[model samples]
Target chain A: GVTTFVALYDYVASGETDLSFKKGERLQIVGYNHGDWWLAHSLTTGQTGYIPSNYVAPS
Target chain B: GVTTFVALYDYVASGETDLSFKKGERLQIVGYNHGDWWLAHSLTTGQTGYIPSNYVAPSD
Candidate 1:
């Protein structure tokens, strides 16, 4: 994610504690907008912090 | 460098003819905003047209 891989954010964790990721499993990542981690990310319309990184694993 | 190989612009040409590119040379590339290519790029922060590709040569 953005922490160990991407240089933008400090760390990129799952929106949920047990978030499962599969190949080509469409997902998103948002930083600095999560309200105390419960509302980790807004769904309807948020920001552009999400990128292909949310789908790809760090090599 | 949002041009050739950038999956954006078709080709990335030097703003000027005979534009010399040295190793690690920091140049810029601005497109669509040039008036006859004279004011090709706005120095005081225009768009993020130019990127590190302006410095890196295409691999052989």
Candidate 2:
């Protein structure tokens, strides 16, 4: 089963492959810790990449 | 410019989208953390994904 998380801050992409997140954005966790990173698919942007764990919380 | 790194250990993908690495593998970093993960394209498999930063090091 997949998990979900809500972004707590606005994160701009650091590079071409990095995923960006907006405050309060919801993401479906397709993967996890696998440390500070989790493979998440953004529900808003419909894009997936590694998002900071500290910037998101379980939804 | 790109940064090349060597895999310190074998890493299995957590998901299909994630890149898998073998110990002693070399990769070219295409992106950096905007934490523990760095986006890299493996020279071995030619696949790209978020790889643990700790699992790799700059290629000498």
Candidate 3:
């Protein structure tokens, strides 16, 4: 089965990346999602949101 | 010595992943520091955070 890619902008990468990993796939990290933003669940603090997953990836 | 895991919070995992990563160990992703918040040098813009390195990890 396929896995989910998480965003590490405010946490990891410190909001960095060359737009390559910024769009990190749930499994690898790539491509962009529809709409101005997307959903991300926080397994760390039981949180959720529609944060700007833009320009946020691995450099 | 141990490796330090970076919190791939708002970037990579889309701030996702289970508590197993939030506290990423720069290598694996886990554990915590001390002193009510601290610093995180920006390898990108010199920006850092006194974030709660706790409750973060790869997954449940």
Candidate 4:
């Protein structure tokens, strides 16, 4: 099942593999099997990256 | 390039989607696009999933 999420804080990665997002950005949950990190598709950049689970919440 | 890695910590996932590994276990680097996490294939379970980059180091 797919879910929508909202970034609670500004999070960016130095690597291109990871998606960067600012506070209030929205993401589409791609995968969540890894409890510590959630794979999400960034609506801002149109890229997919793993995000720290604590940094976002369900929207 | 495919690289080998060793787990520094025992990371167990309750979800079936994530691969689980124990300390000293070896993993094959599948992808590293995610710096915070590296997509790896666990030798123990033969499953592929993302592992915390800090939890694993290059086997070489």
Candidate 5:
């Protein structure tokens, strides 16, 4: 199931992940990846990418 | 002409079309759309999407 979360700070991509996000953007958690990365879809942008699991909180 | 830019900060997309990008990621400005949106390709993920024109600056 998808869960909503809010970005706490601007997250930069390491050039290693599929996605990166900005602070204050809303995202939907779609899947969990290894380590801290979680697959998410941006509610504001509709783009799908991997974000750090700790970068967001329940919205 | 094609231009190289670096993201100044994280950019979130409005979902109107294609892309969103992150801070510090290098991007290639491939195309532009109306009102602040531009077609960008991520050097990091190889993802092509629309990004805000203001979100990036000429690569140093």
Candidate 6:
């Protein structure tokens, strides 16, 4: 989507595997699933997965 | 409980005040009460709240 947001905390994927990311990395909000989790794509790694909605703020 | 792990990225608490943190900060895993969320206490801020389980990795 090319939209940008800042990462305020670090994430390491435990099971979903592809969602891993580091703190301060910029990410793009791709889609909203329904609740709690939102689909995000990493600008650094180009990876996509569900991230907690509360874990990010709109920038 | 005293534990340690490294922050892989930064997180901003959109609603939860205690959950916000910066990248590369050390944190402690305190509890996992339910699905997808784990209770974490920041070593830097000393605040406690829920974080996604996948957002953290176990450290030695």
Among the numbered candidates, top lDDT falls to 2
Interface CA root-mean-square deviation for model 2: 16.7
Ten-residue region with minimum lDDT total, candidate 2 chain A = A21-30
Which model is ahead, 2 or 3, in terms of DockQ? 2
Ranked by lDDT from best down, the candidates are 2, 4, 5, 6, 3, 1
Clashes of 6: 13
List clashing residue pairs in candidate 2: none
| Cα lDDT tens digits for candidate 1, B1-60 | 221221222324322221222222222222313311111122222322222112222221
Model 2 residue A19 CA deviation (Å) reads: 16
Question: Model-by-model lDDT, in order?
Answer: 0.23, 0.49, 0.29, 0.47, 0.46, 0.45
The DockQ score of candidate 1 comes to 0.02
Model 2 residue runs over 4 Å out of place are A1-36, A39-49, A52-59, B16-35
Chain B TM-scores, listed for every candidate in order, come to 0.24, 0.61, 0.29, 0.55, 0.58, 0.53
Q: What range of 10 consecutive residues in model 5 chain A has the weakest lDDT sum?
A: A26-35
Pairs that clash in candidate 1: B1-B51
Of candidate 3 chain B, the 10-residue stretch with the lowest lDDT total is: B27-36
- Local accuracy of candidate 3 as per-residue lDDT tens digits, B22-42: 432122112212211222233
Ranking by DockQ: 6, 5, 2, 3, 4, 1
Off by over 4 Å in 1: A1-15, A32-59, B1-60
Docking category of candidate 3:
incorrect
Q: Point out where model 4 deviates above 4 Å.
A: A16-35, B1-60
Q: Among these predicted structures, which one has the highest TM-score? A: 2
The ten-residue window of minimal lDDT in model 4 chain B covers B18-27
lDDT of 6 by residue, B1-36 (tens): 225655655555534222333443323322223235
How does each model score on TM-score?
0.15, 0.41, 0.23, 0.36, 0.34, 0.33
